[PDB]
Design a binder for this molecule. Sequence first.
Ligand SMILES: *[C@@H]1O[C@H](CO)[C@@H](O[C@@H]2O[C@H](CO)[C@@H](O[C@@H]3O[C@H](CO[C@H]4O[C@H](CO[C@H]5O[C@H](CO)[C@@H](O)[C@H](O)[C@@H]5O)[C@@H](O)[C@H](O[C@H]5O[C@H](CO)[C@@H](O)[C@H](O)[C@@H]5O)[C@@H]4O)[C@@H](O)[C@H](O)[C@@H]3O)[C@H](O)[C@H]2NC(C)=O)[C@H](O)[C@H]1NC(C)=O
Ligand SMILES: *[C@@H]1O[C@H](CO)[C@@H](O[C@@H]2O[C@H](CO)[C@@H](O[C@@H]3O[C@H](CO[C@H]4O[C@H](CO[C@H]5O[C@H](CO)[C@@H](O)[C@H](O)[C@@H]5O)[C@@H](O)[C@H](O[C@H]5O[C@H](CO)[C@@H](O)[C@H](O)[C@@H]5O)[C@@H]4O)[C@@H](O)[C@H](O)[C@@H]3O)[C@H](O)[C@H]2NC(C)=O)[C@H](O)[C@H]1NC(C)=O
Ligand SMILES: *[C@@H]1O[C@H](CO)[C@@H](O[C@@H]2O[C@H](CO)[C@@H](O[C@@H]3O[C@H](CO[C@H]4O[C@H](CO[C@H]5O[C@H](CO)[C@@H](O)[C@H](O)[C@@H]5O)[C@@H](O)[C@H](O[C@H]5O[C@H](CO)[C@@H](O)[C@H](O)[C@@H]5O)[C@@H]4O)[C@@H](O)[C@H](O)[C@@H]3O)[C@H](O)[C@H]2NC(C)=O)[C@H](O)[C@H]1NC(C)=O
Ligand SMILES: *[C@@H]1O[C@H](CO)[C@@H](O[C@@H]2O[C@H](CO)[C@@H](O[C@@H]3O[C@H](CO[C@H]4O[C@H](CO[C@H]5O[C@H](CO)[C@@H](O)[C@H](O)[C@@H]5O)[C@@H](O)[C@H](O[C@H]5O[C@H](CO)[C@@H](O)[C@H](O)[C@@H]5O)[C@@H]4O)[C@@H](O)[C@H](O)[C@@H]3O)[C@H](O)[C@H]2NC(C)=O)[C@H](O)[C@H]1NC(C)=O
Ligand SMILES: *[C@@H]1O[C@H](CO)[C@@H](O[C@@H]2O[C@H](CO)[C@@H](O[C@@H]3O[C@H](CO)[C@@H](O)[C@H](O)[C@@H]3O)[C@H](O)[C@H]2NC(C)=O)[C@H](O)[C@H]1NC(C)=O
Ligand SMILES: *[C@@H]1O[C@H](CO)[C@@H](O[C@@H]2O[C@H](CO)[C@@H](O[C@@H]3O[C@H](CO)[C@@H](O)[C@H](O)[C@@H]3O)[C@H](O)[C@H]2NC(C)=O)[C@H](O)[C@H]1NC(C)=O
Ligand SMILES: *[C@@H]1O[C@H](CO)[C@@H](O[C@@H]2O[C@H](CO)[C@@H](O[C@@H]3O[C@H](CO)[C@@H](O)[C@H](O)[C@@H]3O)[C@H](O)[C@H]2NC(C)=O)[C@H](O)[C@H]1NC(C)=O
Ligand SMILES: *[C@@H]1O[C@H](CO)[C@@H](O[C@@H]2O[C@H](CO)[C@@H](O[C@@H]3O[C@H](CO)[C@@H](O)[C@H](O)[C@@H]3O)[C@H](O)[C@H]2NC(C)=O)[C@H](O)[C@H]1NC(C)=O
Ligand SMILES: [Ca+2]
Ligand SMILES: [Ca+2]
Ligand SMILES: [Ca+2]
Ligand SMILES: [Ca+2]
Lengths: 389, 389, 389, 389
Amino acid sequence: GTFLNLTKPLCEVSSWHILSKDNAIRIGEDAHILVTREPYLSCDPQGCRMFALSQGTTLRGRHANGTIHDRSPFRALISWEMGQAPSPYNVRVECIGWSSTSCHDGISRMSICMSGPNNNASAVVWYGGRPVTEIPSWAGNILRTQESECVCHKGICPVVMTDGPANNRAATKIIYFKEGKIQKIEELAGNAQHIEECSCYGAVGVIKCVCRDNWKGANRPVITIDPEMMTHTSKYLCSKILTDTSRPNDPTNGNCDAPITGGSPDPGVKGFAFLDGENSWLGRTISKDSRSGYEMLKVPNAETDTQSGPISHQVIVNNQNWSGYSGAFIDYWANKECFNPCFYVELIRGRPKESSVLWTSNSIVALCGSKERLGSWSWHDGAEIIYFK
Amino acid sequence: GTFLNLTKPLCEVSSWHILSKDNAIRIGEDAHILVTREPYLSCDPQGCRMFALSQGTTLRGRHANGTIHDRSPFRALISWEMGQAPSPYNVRVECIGWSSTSCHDGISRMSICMSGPNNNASAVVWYGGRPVTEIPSWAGNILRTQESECVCHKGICPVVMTDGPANNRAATKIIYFKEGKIQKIEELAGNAQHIEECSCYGAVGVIKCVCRDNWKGANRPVITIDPEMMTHTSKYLCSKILTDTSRPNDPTNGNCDAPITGGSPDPGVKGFAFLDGENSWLGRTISKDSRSGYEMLKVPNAETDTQSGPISHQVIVNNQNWSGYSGAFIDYWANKECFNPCFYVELIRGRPKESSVLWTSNSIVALCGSKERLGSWSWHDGAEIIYFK
Amino acid sequence: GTFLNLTKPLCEVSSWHILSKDNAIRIGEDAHILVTREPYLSCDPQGCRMFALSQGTTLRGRHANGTIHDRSPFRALISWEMGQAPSPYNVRVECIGWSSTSCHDGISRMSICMSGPNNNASAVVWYGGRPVTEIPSWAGNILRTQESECVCHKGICPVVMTDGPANNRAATKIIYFKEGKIQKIEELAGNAQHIEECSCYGAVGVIKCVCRDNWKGANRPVITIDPEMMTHTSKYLCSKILTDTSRPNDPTNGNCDAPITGGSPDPGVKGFAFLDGENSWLGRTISKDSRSGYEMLKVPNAETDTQSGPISHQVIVNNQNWSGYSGAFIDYWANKECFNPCFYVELIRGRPKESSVLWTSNSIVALCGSKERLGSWSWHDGAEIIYFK
Amino acid sequence: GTFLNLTKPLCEVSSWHILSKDNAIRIGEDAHILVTREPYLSCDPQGCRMFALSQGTTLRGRHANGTIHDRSPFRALISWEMGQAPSPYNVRVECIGWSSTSCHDGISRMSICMSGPNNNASAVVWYGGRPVTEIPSWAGNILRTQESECVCHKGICPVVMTDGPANNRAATKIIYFKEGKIQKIEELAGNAQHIEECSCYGAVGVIKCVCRDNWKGANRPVITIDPEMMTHTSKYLCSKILTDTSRPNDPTNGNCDAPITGGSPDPGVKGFAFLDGENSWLGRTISKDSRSGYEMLKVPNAETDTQSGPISHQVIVNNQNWSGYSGAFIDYWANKECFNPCFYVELIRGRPKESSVLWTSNSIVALCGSKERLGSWSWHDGAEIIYFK
Ligand SMILES: *[C@@H]1O[C@H](CO)[C@@H](O[C@@H]2O[C@H](CO)[C@@H](O[C@@H]3O[C@H](CO[C@H]4O[C@H](CO[C@H]5O[C@H](CO)[C@@H](O)[C@H](O)[C@@H]5O)[C@@H](O)[C@H](O[C@H]5O[C@H](CO)[C@@H](O)[C@H](O)[C@@H]5O)[C@@H]4O)[C@@H](O)[C@H](O)[C@@H]3O)[C@H](O)[C@H]2NC(C)=O)[C@H](O)[C@H]1NC(C)=O
Ligand SMILES: *[C@@H]1O[C@H](CO)[C@@H](O[C@@H]2O[C@H](CO)[C@@H](O[C@@H]3O[C@H](CO[C@H]4O[C@H](CO[C@H]5O[C@H](CO)[C@@H](O)[C@H](O)[C@@H]5O)[C@@H](O)[C@H](O[C@H]5O[C@H](CO)[C@@H](O)[C@H](O)[C@@H]5O)[C@@H]4O)[C@@H](O)[C@H](O)[C@@H]3O)[C@H](O)[C@H]2NC(C)=O)[C@H](O)[C@H]1NC(C)=O
Ligand SMILES: *[C@@H]1O[C@H](CO)[C@@H](O[C@@H]2O[C@H](CO)[C@@H](O[C@@H]3O[C@H](CO[C@H]4O[C@H](CO[C@H]5O[C@H](CO)[C@@H](O)[C@H](O)[C@@H]5O)[C@@H](O)[C@H](O[C@H]5O[C@H](CO)[C@@H](O)[C@H](O)[C@@H]5O)[C@@H]4O)[C@@H](O)[C@H](O)[C@@H]3O)[C@H](O)[C@H]2NC(C)=O)[C@H](O)[C@H]1NC(C)=O
Ligand SMILES: *[C@@H]1O[C@H](CO)[C@@H](O[C@@H]2O[C@H](CO)[C@@H](O[C@@H]3O[C@H](CO[C@H]4O[C@H](CO[C@H]5O[C@H](CO)[C@@H](O)[C@H](O)[C@@H]5O)[C@@H](O)[C@H](O[C@H]5O[C@H](CO)[C@@H](O)[C@H](O)[C@@H]5O)[C@@H]4O)[C@@H](O)[C@H](O)[C@@H]3O)[C@H](O)[C@H]2NC(C)=O)[C@H](O)[C@H]1NC(C)=O
Ligand SMILES: *[C@@H]1O[C@H](CO)[C@@H](O[C@@H]2O[C@H](CO)[C@@H](O[C@@H]3O[C@H](CO)[C@@H](O)[C@H](O)[C@@H]3O)[C@H](O)[C@H]2NC(C)=O)[C@H](O)[C@H]1NC(C)=O
Ligand SMILES: *[C@@H]1O[C@H](CO)[C@@H](O[C@@H]2O[C@H](CO)[C@@H](O[C@@H]3O[C@H](CO)[C@@H](O)[C@H](O)[C@@H]3O)[C@H](O)[C@H]2NC(C)=O)[C@H](O)[C@H]1NC(C)=O
Ligand SMILES: *[C@@H]1O[C@H](CO)[C@@H](O[C@@H]2O[C@H](CO)[C@@H](O[C@@H]3O[C@H](CO)[C@@H](O)[C@H](O)[C@@H]3O)[C@H](O)[C@H]2NC(C)=O)[C@H](O)[C@H]1NC(C)=O
Ligand SMILES: *[C@@H]1O[C@H](CO)[C@@H](O[C@@H]2O[C@H](CO)[C@@H](O[C@@H]3O[C@H](CO)[C@@H](O)[C@H](O)[C@@H]3O)[C@H](O)[C@H]2NC(C)=O)[C@H](O)[C@H]1NC(C)=O
Ligand SMILES: [Ca+2]
Ligand SMILES: [Ca+2]
Ligand SMILES: [Ca+2]
Ligand SMILES: [Ca+2]
C-alpha cells in the first residue's frame, strides 16, 4: 500500500444512484441482527465497508429493550462487508465505545472510539487493528466525535472532536493523526459556534466537514481543513436552504457568519453536504421538524451565496418514512479520474418516534453521484413495525 | 488474471450430471435463509458461485409475506458459494435492484442491477466490486435484463437489455461493455419480435442467447452475437419442439422467422438452449401450461430444422413438482479442451401456485453435460409446504 | 504443492489421544446444524477437515423427519473446519449425492459422489473443486463407495467402488485416478466375497483397506493395493477377534481365506483397522449385536495370525452409548518422520435405535495414535434425547 | 515469521484503557452463542484473539443445563476473532479438553488441552494446528494448566502444569516447549506451596507468572522463569495487599516466603499481577469473600515490599456485579518500543451465584495499559438474568 493523496477533483454530480442497502430491520425481524445506530461507510483500497455503533444485543433479543439510550459499556464500533446486515457472526469489532470515527490512510485503517462515564470519557485510537494512542476528556462532558468517516492525505488524518455541553459553548479540537499518533492539536477556530458530528470528504488537497450546531443554528457549520499545513477555518453554510433538523422555514437569505435560530423541537441531527461551487448538493430531512424523509438538493454556490436555492432535487426517502443521521464518504481508491461523492442515510426505527416497541435501531441506505439524470424512488427502511409487536 | 477468450468448441453432450443443489427451502424452514427468486450461476477463474435476487427478508420471517411481488427497494443481487443456501451471513451483495446479470471477464466480475420505479428505472454497472457506469431508462417502462450470466470475450461482455411493455413491442438493446464501460450500443435487430431474460453462452468466438418472447411466440427467440465485431442477428428457434411456457402442443413444423402463438395462461418463462448442430439440447417445463416439471431434449439441428424432434431425453424435475426459470452458464475456466454446457433450474415454491403460504421463494439445482449416458432422477425442491403452515 | 508420496512407515501406537469432537447433536438442539450421517475426516497440506453426507435439512427442522432414509436428491458431501459442527453457514459442498469418498493428492482434492435412482446411479468425480469425470452404474444396483477418505501416492488415488446387491455377490472395482481422471480399472480380485465401505490408509508405498462384507462374513475383508503398479489383492482379517457388527462370539481361530458367518441381526457396519505386524490395532463396536460402544484392541499380527488376541485395549465409547460407522485417516502432511494412524467414530443418534424422535443424525469423535500410554474415557455423543422431545 | 524474542521492557502504566468486550451473555440470550468459561486472550503477529473452554452447547440450548460442572468430554479450547462473541459458526477448535493454555512463538501457535478422567488425564500439545506431543498424568489427579496464555522467547515456551490434590500438596512442573516438543522438564522449586492457573507475561528476557495457591495462601504465588537457561524460582507476592479470593482483610505486613491463610469460603480464583518495581499493578476482586467486582491497584514494589500499598486505583467491574477469573496477556507484536501490559476479566453469570438459572457461562472484558490518566467506568457483563427465566 501507499498513503492516499487527495490529488483528484470532485466528480460532477447530476443525480444519485443506489450503492448499497442492508435492509437490516426487515431481516433482523427473524435473523440474528445486532441493534445499532449511528452508521456510516468507509472504504479502503480493497473495497467499502459498513460501520455502526452496536448496542451489544440482537434486535429480537430481550436486551434490545432500552436501546434508545446512547451511552453504555455494551456499545462498540463494528464494521462489516457492504450490503450485508450486521450480525454477531459477520462483524469486525473496531474499538469499544459509544462515539466513533474511522478512515483508511491508504496503508492501514485508523479507528477511534470514545467510552466511559459522561464526566470522564476517553478516546482510544486504533491503527492497523491495534490500539496506539489514548486521549482523556479535556472538558469533562462526553468527549465525542464524528460518527462518520475521517479523511486522510499523505498519511495525515484530521479528526474533529468535541467535549463539553450539547446545549451551550463546548470545547472542540481538530486532532491531526499519522499512524494513529498525534502530530498536532488545534482548538476550533472560525465562526462556528458549536460543532457536533462532522461529515467530511476531501478533494484537491482540501478536506471539508459539514457539521451539526446543536446549540444555536439551523444552518450547518462548515469546517475547511488543510491537511498539509494542518490548519483550518470554520463558518456556516451560506445558503438560505437550511439543512439541520429541526429548522424554521427557509428564509429569503441565509447567513455565512452566524447561526440562524428557530425550529422545534429537535436541537439537531448529523448531516452533510458536498460543496464545490456550482457542483454543490445539500442533504436534509424532508420534515423541518422531525427526522422523517430525506432529500438531496442541488444548490449552486451554497457555500458563498446567501440567496442560493435548489435547481434540482432528488427524494431519497419519502416523507412518510423515518430517516435519521446522514453523512459523507468517498471511495478514494476507485478507478476514476475524479473522487465521486457518496452519502448514506440512517433509517431509524423504534423509539422515540415508534414507541410501541421497546428498542431503537436502524438500517442503512447509501448512494453515490452520477453524471446521468437518473430516475429515483424512495429507499425507506421497509420493515413493518407491527411484525415486531 | 487475463481476459477470457472464447477459443474452445462446445463439449459434446449425451446426458446431464448433477453439479449442485442448495435445498434452500428445506433448510430455510428452520435456518436463516433469504427469500430469493430469479437465481443463476456464474463462474470465475477460482470457481463457480450461485446468484439470485434477494427479497431482503428471511423465508420464515414475517416480511416474507408479499414476496410474490417482483420489484421493491428491498431487493438486491446476491452471490454465494456454490451449493450453500443463501443466508444473511454468507452472501455477497453484488448490486442493488430487481433485475440483474453478471459475468467475469477473466480478470474481474461485472455485475449489473436495475432499480427504481417502473417509469424511471436505471441500471448500475459494477466492475471489480465498484460501480463504474449508470444507464437511465430509455423507454420509461421497467428497464430490465437477463436474470442469468452474461459472457465475455477478449474483455468485451455483451448484455441484452429491454425497456418497454411486457405485452407489446418494446425497445431492446445490446450493450457491449469492457471493464463495465460502454464500448458500443446496438438496437435489437433481426426477426425476434420481443426479447426478455436472455440465457447466453459462448464458444469459438460466438455468443448465443436464447430468450423469452413475452408478447407473441411460444418458440424462443435466439440472438447470435459476435463480440469482436460487436454485431448481432436474431431469429426464432426453428424446431417444432416449442420451449416457452405457456405453449400449444408442438406442431408438425416450427418457424425460424416468426412467433408461433398459442398456449394459455402464462405469457412466458425464462429458458435456454444449447445450439450446436447435432449437439443441440432444448430445456423446457414438462407442462405446456404451467411452470411444472423440467425436461432436457436432444433435438439435433434445432437451430435450422423446422421438423427437428427429440432423439433423447432426460427428466430433470418430474411433472409432479414445481420448476421455474432456467438458464445457461459455463465454467469457461475448467481444465477441459472444450467448454461444457451447464444449466440451472429455479425451483419455485409458494405463490401463486401454492397460495396456502404468504411467500414466494425458490431453491436451485444445476447440472452439466456428460459424454456418458448417465442415469437420472428428479431433482425437485424437496420441501413439504405443510411444514410451513 | 507437490504430489504426496507414501514414503514414510506407520507410527508405532500404544494408545489413542483425542484429536477432535464436534458435539454436533448437543449444539444442534438449539443452533442451525445440518442433519448428517456417514462422516469422516480427510487432511491436506494446510490441515484436516470433517466430511459427511448432509441430508439437506437442519436437525431441529421439520424436514429432519424421515432422515433414517439413506438415499434422496437432497443429500450432498459437505466438508467443514475440523472441530466445528456442520451448519448451513460453514460447510463447503464437495459434490451432490448419497455415497462418497474424498482425498487430497498433495496438490488438489478429489471428491466423488454417487447419486440417482437405485437402478441407474452415477458417480461424479471432482478435482480441485470442478467436476472432471462421470461414471455410470455398471450393475444397476446402487453404485456406491467408501464413505471415508481415499489415499494418494505419486498422483495416483485408488478408490474402491461397489455396484450390485447388498445381500449377495456384487461387482466391486478398484478405480485408479489421477487428477480425477481414470488411469486404470480393475475388477475386484482375491478372496473377499463382498466389499462395502472400505476404510483405507497408506505407508511405505502400500495402501491397505479394511472393509465390510455385508453378505457373509463377520470378519472384515482386507484389500491391499500397490498404487504404483496399480494392482491389488484381497483376503479376510485373519484374527479370531471379529470386528464387523453383528458378529458371533469370537471363535478360537479366525479365517484369512473365507467369511466367518453368524451374528444377528445387523448384516454389517463400516469399520477399520491398522495392520502393521505387531503394531496392529482393530476397532469394533463393544456390542456384538448392535452399533453400541467402541473399543480399540491391539492385536499383534492380526493380519496373519488366526489365533491372535488383544494384548491391550482402549474404550473409545462406552457400551451404554451409541456408536456407528468408523474409518481411518492420516495427516500425511504432518511434521513427523512417520505417518500416524487416526480414526473417527460416528456417533449415531435417533432412528432406528432411538425411535422416539423422527430423525437420524450423528456427531463425530476422532483420535490419533500416541506412543505414550495415555489414560482414556468415553467420548460419547453427549446429547440428551429427551431434550429433543 | 521469526521467533519472538522478549527484548523489550514493560511499558509504564498509569491507568487502563478498554481493549475489547464481547457482551456474549447479552447477545447469547437470543443468538447462537456457545456456553464457555475460563476465557483469555492471546495475540500473534496478525492480531489478538479471544480463547475459552467451550461446554459444547449454546447458552439458550437445553444442554446448557448442568454447565456448572468443570470437566466433561464435551469441552474444547476454542478461539475467535477478538470482540466477537463465541458462536458455533465463528470459532476455531484449538484442541479438545477441560484445561488449556496457548501461545504464539512468532512463527506458529502452540495450544495445549488436558482431557480424560480425573485419575488418568492427559495433555495433547498442538503446534501449527497439528498435534505433536502427548503427556500422561504423572500424579493421577486432574492434570491441568494455566487457563491463560503462555509466553515464548527465542522459540522456547514454558508452561506451568499441576497434577495432584486441589486442597493439599500437588506435583507442579514447568515444561519447556519448542515447536510443541519438550526440551526440558523441571519440578516446581521455590517457596510456593501450591500452584494453580498461572497468569504469565514476559519482558527483557524474563517470564513472570502470578498464580493461585488453592491450598493455603491468600497471597498469590509468583514464579519467575528464565526461558534461555530454562530455570525458575518461586515465592509469594510480598505486598500486604492480598489478591486471591477468598482472603482475609489486608494485614499490616504481607509475606514473601509463606502463605497467609484465612478468608472464607472460596479456596481461590485465577488472577494476575504485573510486577515491575514502581510500575507494579495488582488485580483482585473487590469482595474479599466472593468473585464480585474487580479493581486494579498500583502498588509500587509489591514484589519486594511487605508493607507496600496502593498509590492509585481503577475500578474495572463494580462490586454490584459478578467477576471471575482474570489473567495477563501482551500483544508482543505491537508497533511499540515497550511491551504493554493487558489483562482480561471473566464475567461469570449463572451458577452458583445465580442459581435461578440452570447454566454457568461468562462474557469477557479486556483492557491494556495507558501512560495517560484515563477516566473509568464499570465494564460489567450487562445481561439481565430475568430475561433468561
Ligand atoms: C425521472 O427521474 C428524474 C430524476 O429523478 C426526474 O427528474 C426530476 O424532474 C423534476 C421535474 O422536472 C425536477 O424538479 C425540479 O426541481 C427543482 C428544485 O425543486 C426543489 O426545491 C424547490 C424549492 O425549495 C425551496 O423553496 C420552497 C418554496 O418555494 C420551500 O418549500 C423549500 O423548503 C425550499 O426553500 C422545492 O419547491 C421542491 O419541492 C418539491 O420536491 C420536494 C422534495 O425535494 C417535495 O417534498 C415537494 O413537495 C416538491 O415536490 C424541491 O425540493 C424545482 O425548482 C423545479 O420547479 C422542478 O420541480 C428535478 O430536479 C429532477 N431531478 C433530477 C435529479 O434531475 C424526473 O421527474 C423523473 N421522471 C418522472 C416521469 O418521474
Ligand atoms: C438409465 O438412464 C438413462 C439416461 O437417463 C436412460 O436412458 C434413456 O432411455 C430412454 C429409453 O430408451 C430414452 O428414451 C427415448 O427418448 C426419445 C425422446 O423422447 C422424448 O421426446 C419424445 C417426443 O416428444 C415429441 O413428440 C411427442 C408426441 O409424440 C410430444 O408429446 C412431445 O411434446 C414432443 O413434441 C417424447 O414422446 C418423450 O416423452 C417421454 O418423456 C417425457 C419426458 O421428457 C415424459 O414426460 C413422457 O411421458 C414420455 O415418458 C420424450 O420427451 C424417444 O423418441 C424414444 O422413443 C425413447 O423414449 C432416453 O432418451 C434415454 N436418455 C438418455 C439421456 O440417454 C435409461 O432409460 C435408464 N435406464 C433405466 C432402466 O431407467
Ligand atoms: C490409565 O489409562 C491406561 C490406558 O487407557 C490404562 O491402561 C490399561 O490398563 C488395563 C489394565 O492393565 C489394560 O487392560 C488389559 O487389556 C488386555 C486386553 O483386554 C482386552 O481384550 C480382552 C480379551 O478379549 C477377547 O477375549 C474375551 C474373552 O476372554 C472376549 O470377551 C473378547 O470378545 C475377545 O475375544 C478382553 O477380555 C478385555 O475386555 C475388557 O475390556 C473391554 C473393552 O475393550 C470391556 O468391554 C470388558 O468388560 C473388559 O473390561 C479387553 O477388550 C487384557 O488381556 C488384560 O488382562 C488387561 O485387562 C489395558 O490394555 C491398558 N490400556 C492401554 C492402552 O494401555 C489404565 O488402566 C488406566 N489407569 C486407571 C487407574 O484407570
Ligand atoms: C477521572 O478518572 C480518573 C482515573 O480513573 C480518576 O482518577 C482517580 O482519582 C482518585 C481520587 O484522586 C484516585 O483515588 C486514590 O486512590 C488511592 C488508592 O486507593 C485504593 O487503595 C486504598 C487503600 O486500600 C487499602 O487499605 C484499605 C483501608 O485503608 C483497605 O480497605 C484495602 O483493602 C487496602 O488494604 C483504598 O482505600 C481505595 O478504596 C477505594 O476504591 C475502592 C476500589 O478500588 C473502593 O471499593 C473503595 O470503596 C474506595 O472507594 C482504593 O482501592 C487512595 O490512596 C487515594 O486516597 C485516592 O482515593 C485514583 O487513584 C485515580 N485513578 C487513577 C487511575 O488515576 C478520577 O477520580 C476521575 N474523575 C472523576 C471526577 O471521577
Ligand atoms: C423493558 O425495560 C424496562 C425498564 O427497565 C422494564 O420496566 C421496568 O420493570 C421493572 C420490573 O417490573 C420495574 O421495577 C419496579 O419498579 C418499582 C418502582 O418503580 C419497584 O417498586 C419494584 O420493586 C420494581 O423494582 C420498573 O419500574 C420498570 N420501569 C419502567 C420504566 O417501566 C420493562 O419491564 C422491560 N420490558 C420487557 C418486556 O422486558
Ligand atoms: C400479509 O400481508 C397482507 C397484505 O398487507 C396483510 O393483509 C392486510 O392486513 C391489513 C391489516 O389488517 C388490512 O388492512 C385493512 O384494510 C382495510 C381496507 O381494505 C381497512 O379498512 C383497515 O383499516 C385496514 O387498513 C388489509 O386489507 C389486508 N390486505 C389483504 C390483501 O388482505 C396480512 O395481514 C399479512 N399477513 C400476515 C400473517 O402477516
Ligand atoms: C413425519 O413424516 C411422516 C411420514 O411422512 C408423517 O406421517 C404421515 O402423515 C401423513 C399425513 O397425515 C399420513 O398421510 C395419510 O395417509 C393415509 C393413508 O395411509 C391417507 O388416507 C391420508 O389421506 C393421508 O395421506 C401418512 O400415513 C403418515 N405416514 C406414517 C408412516 O405415519 C408424519 O406426520 C411426520 N411427522 C411430523 C411431526 O411432521
Ligand atoms: C436439568 O438437569 C437436571 C439434572 O439432570 C434435571 O433434573 C433431574 O431430572 C431427572 C428426570 O426427572 C430426575 O431423575 C429422576 O431421579 C429419581 C431419583 O432421584 C428417579 O426416581 C427417577 O426415575 C428419575 O430418574 C433427577 O432426579 C433430576 N435431578 C435433579 C438434581 O433434580 C432437570 O430436569 C434438568 N432441567 C431441565 C429444565 O432440563
Ligand atoms: Ca441545530
Ligand atoms: Ca411466450
Ligand atoms: Ca458382515
Ligand atoms: Ca488461595
